[PDB]
UniProtKB/Swiss-Prot annotation:
The record marks 166, 180 as: Participates in a stacking interactions with the tyrosyl of cYY. It comes from Mycobacterium tuberculosis (strain CDC 1551 / Oshkosh). This is Mycocyclosin synthase. Catalyzes C-C bond formation between the carbons ortho to the phenolic hydroxyl of cyclo(L-tyr-L-tyr) (cYY) producing mycocyclosin. Can also use cyclo(L-Tyr-L-Phe) (cYF), cyclo(L-Tyr-L-Trp) (cYW) and cyclo(L-Tyr-L-3,4-dihydroxyphenylalanine) (cY-DOPA) as substrate. It is found in: Cytoplasm. Belongs to the cytochrome P450 family. The gene is cyp121.
Length: 394
């Protein structure tokens, strides 16, 4: 006798399990068991993943309802699952989105300068270097302090909340609440700090004192800072880290992008397509009975949208495991989601990776892993797939 198929399948972020392709072919929507013991529908084809993400009756907000089948325990207050809705309802969506584009004057130069400084320090210290803890994550942290308008020196403490905040746990996590409450208090103080006049927090601080926002809660303003720092830093740092592995594993591509840096945007788009950074399918709760392929999903059931199911689907991306810079549908992947909850930071995430890769290839054109790839330690029970250390030489 066999147990119901368990998710997630593998915490390894350097390769897709052969099992995903078999599953997509045989059962592109299939029942699975999550780490909480809940049942869920796992969707793994491009067509069905898109259908779910574009139908708001598959609700993000409702996943936080008491008594719902859960993918994992909440690590934030339940109302924060509706963060973007709360921002929109407060009239802040346009301002928040404008503050997190890569377009502010000086931002791209700051990114380049930071990347080059991190890499110079690694070169001075000598190989081996850890490209996650000493390059990709500090680059993400520094970027997000700049985008938020907060002091660079405050970045590391906020960053250290994230190894817990983005856990994928069967049970509530006491440390997540301690760190959340502290980080909210920090952002509330930022909003009261007259020196904070730039970036997202500088803009929110002004809007907070504008009559058109006088009934928006101080809690929401602080929440925007905590959430955009956390989501952005974990997502950009984790994506860049695993993208560097995929690049290092492809010397011909590394060399092509080093020789022709104008191809880096196309390369990053393919690295996004093949990225395994999200450790679990994206969760949604059905708010009606909805046909998805051969399954009638019932109201109240949990649906998990497997991004790599869509992104490696050969019916949409032929030769899906290959990085090809000339595809006709290159941004049509689901790395940033799709529909109501499409990533509001997509342009910034692209530029973070493009600048980080450009700087790395210029400074370390001979970059290579310093350990066999199987020696990387993949973090478990986390909402991203990342190697604990990424040891390289050059
Ligand atoms: C390459 C880096 C990134 C990747 C791969 C990525 C991926 C994603 C994905 C897949 C979603 C959709 C989640 C869902 O539908 O359930 C999402 C949402 C989100 N992302 Fe990004 N993201 C990245 C960068 C960023 C950055 C730089 C920020 C902010 C500075 C950010 C903030 C958010 C927020 C706040 C949401 C939630 C939107 C919502 O609930 O409606 N992300 N991201
Ligand atoms: O904006 C938010 N929208 C939703 C949806 C969401 C869930 C998980 C993700 O990875 C992403 I991207 C988005 C949420 O539930 N929360 C935030 C992100 C956040 C920020 C700080 C935290 O500590 C935890 C989660």
């Amino acid at each position: 006798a066999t147990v119901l198929l368990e998710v997630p399948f593998s915490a390894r972020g350097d390769r897709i399990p052969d099992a995903v392709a078999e599953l997509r072919t045989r059962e592109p929507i299939r029942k699975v068991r999550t780490i909480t013991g809940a049942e869920a529908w796992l969707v793994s084809s491009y067509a069905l993943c898109t259908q779910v993400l574009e139908d708001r009756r598959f609700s993000m907000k409702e996943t936080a309802a008491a008594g719902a089948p859960r993918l994992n325990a909440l690590t934030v207050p339940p109302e924060v699952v509706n963060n973007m809705g709360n921002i929109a309802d407060a009239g802040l969506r346009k301002a928040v989105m404008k503050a997190i584009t890569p377009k502010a004057p000086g931002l791209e130069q700051f990114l380049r300068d930071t990347a080059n400084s991190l890499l110079d320090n690694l070169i001075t210290e000598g190989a081996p270097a850890d490209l996650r803890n000493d390059f990709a994550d500090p680059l993400a942290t520094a970027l997000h302090c700049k985008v938020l308008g907060i002091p660079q020196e405050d970045g590391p403490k906020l960053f250290r909340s994230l190894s817990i905040a983005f856990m994928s746990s069967a049970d509530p996590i006491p440390a997540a609440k301690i760190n959340w409450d502290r980080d909210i208090e920090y952002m509330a103080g930022i909003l009261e700090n007259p020196n904070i006049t730039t970036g997202l927090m500088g803009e929110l601080s002004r809007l907070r004192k504008d009559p058109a926002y006088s009934h928006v809660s101080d809690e929401l303003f602080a929440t925007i800072g905590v959430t955009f720092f956390g989501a952005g830093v974990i997502s950009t740092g984790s994506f860049l880290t695993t993208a560097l592995i995929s690049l290092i594993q492809r010397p011909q591509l590394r060399n092509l992008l080093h020789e022709k840096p104008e191809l880096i945007p196309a390369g990053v788009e393919e690295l996004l397509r093949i990225n395994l950074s999200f450790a679990d399918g994206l969760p949604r709760l059905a708010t009606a009975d909805i046909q998805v392929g051969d399954v009638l999903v019932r109201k109240g059931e949990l649906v998990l949208v497997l991004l790599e199911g869509a992104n490696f689907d050969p019916e949409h991306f032929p030769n899906p495991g290959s990085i090809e810079l000339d595809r006709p549908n290159p941004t049509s992947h689901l790395a940033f989601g799709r529909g109501q909850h499409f990533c509001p930071g997509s342009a910034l995430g692209r530029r973070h990776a493009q600048i980080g890769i450009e700087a790395l290839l210029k400074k370390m054109p001979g970059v290579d892993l310093a350990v066999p790839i199987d020696q990387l330690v993949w973090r478990t029970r986390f909402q991203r797939r990342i190697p604990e250390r990424l040891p390289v030489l050059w």
